[PDB]
């Protein structure tokens, strides 16, 4: 469970990455696909897995949108991400194993762009948020 401290840190982070958000999601997705090729199977219906490629660009916008959703619902992530949980369970059937990979790649991408924001205490808030995220998306598996 996130503290009020954790929530403000995450919300402040999410402000700061404003102009960069869609590009952050595209590059994080590129990182996942290249660093962890296990994940490529779910996007077989693509071209073109490099960042900057149009499918990756547009789906990176989509991922960051789901996370800005999580930020607006940070108080109860289980309820706020129910639709996305169901879709990742039943429509796409995504191994919950993989939510942490994406989160890691988002955090790595962020750290290359906003390193001053990754104090150990902040990284701790971000990790707790992304773990709560994954768990929220895992809710409807069983």
């Amino acid at each position: 469970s996130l503290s009020s401290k954790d929530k403000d840190t995450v919300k402040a982070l999410w402000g700061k990455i404003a102009d960069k958000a869609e590009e952050i999601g595209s590059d994080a997705l590129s990182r996942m696909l290249a660093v962890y090729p296990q994940t490529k199977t779910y996007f077989s219906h693509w071209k073109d897995l490099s960042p900057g490629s149009a499918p990756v660009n547009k789906h990176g916008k989509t991922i960051m949108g789901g996370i800005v959703d999580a930020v607006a619902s940070i108080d109860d992530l289980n309820a706020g991400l129910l639709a996305l949980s169901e879709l990742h369970a039943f429509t796409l059937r995504v191994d919950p194993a993989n939510f942490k990979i994406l989160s890691h790649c988002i955090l790595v991408l962020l750290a290359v762009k906003f390193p001053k924001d990754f104090t150990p205490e902040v990284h701790i808030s971000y990790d707790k948020f992304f773990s709560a995220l994954a768990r929220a998306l895992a809710e409807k598996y069983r």
């Binding site: 990182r31 290249a34 660093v35 790595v108 290359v112 390193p115 990754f118 150990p120």
Partner: protein
């Protein structure tokens, strides 16, 4: 493992840029702060208190340095990592009984410290090579069954 040329170069190049003391001390501190249960393995260090106690801890600094030197031994033995880490694997499994999830936690913290340091140089390709290296090292550290 079979390493491409870009992978060998990339790994050697990364380690050539890291101050082992600063990066090690920072990596271990971050692991102990972000995943505080990992503190239990180092019961004889000092302050189990604030992040500021962890950050200033000289023993933590020291052991962080040792981890980085440990990784250098795999960078210098890239085609023989398992054998190189044989006593290390015994130490961390048989003796210290470190749950292996902790190896990945620590490696992820190091990945974030290096990403912060290197910046745009730490591309997806560069991260892929570094992650492959760390996978090989974590498997070698790694209770060994074969």
């Amino acid at each position: 493992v079979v390493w491409t040329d870009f992978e060998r170069a990339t790994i050697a190049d990364i380690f050539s840029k890291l101050d082992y003391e600063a990066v090690g001390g920072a990596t271990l501190a971050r692991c102990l702060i972000v995943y505080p249960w990992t503190q239990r393995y180092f019961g004889n260090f000092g302050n189990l208190y604030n992040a500021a106690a962890i950050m200033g801890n000289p023993m933590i600094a020291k052991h962080g340095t040792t981890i980085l030197h440990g990784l250098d031994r795999a960078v210098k033995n890239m085609d023989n990592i398992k054998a190189t880490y044989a006593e290390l694997s015994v130490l961390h499994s048989e003796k210290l009984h470190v749950d292996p999830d902790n190896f990945k936690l620590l490696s992820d913290c190091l990945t974030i410290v290096v990403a912060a340091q290197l910046g745009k140089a730490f591309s997806g390709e560069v991260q892929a090579a570094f992650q492959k290296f760390l996978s090989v090292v974590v498997s070698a550290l790694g209770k060994q069954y074969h």
